[PDB]
């Protein structure tokens, strides 16, 4: 959910989930396999 704020700053409420699903000869060595991460927060950016 984005919106504006003083001096044209952009404030946002964020829910983010991302990542892979575990799937085990160097196959995992080549593929990304970056785990899973979810972050829920709210922040504003100039």
């Amino acid at each position: 959910i984005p919106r504006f704020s003083s001096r044209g700053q952009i404030e946002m409420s964020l829910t983010i989930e991302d990542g892979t699903g575990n799937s085990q000869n160097e196959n995992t060595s080549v593929l990304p396999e970056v785990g899973r991460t979810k972050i829920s927060t709210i922040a504003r950016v100039p």
Binding site: I1, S5, E11
Partner: peptide, 27 residues
């Protein structure tokens, strides 16, 4: 005698929000 007005909030959201704390829900 009466006034109808529009106020433009900047630094906050207007609608009440809900957050989950894995058991202690916060409004």
């Amino acid at each position: 005698k009466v006034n109808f007005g529009v106020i433009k909030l900047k630094n906050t959201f207007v609608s009440d929000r809900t957050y989950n704390m894995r058991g202690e829900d916060i409004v």
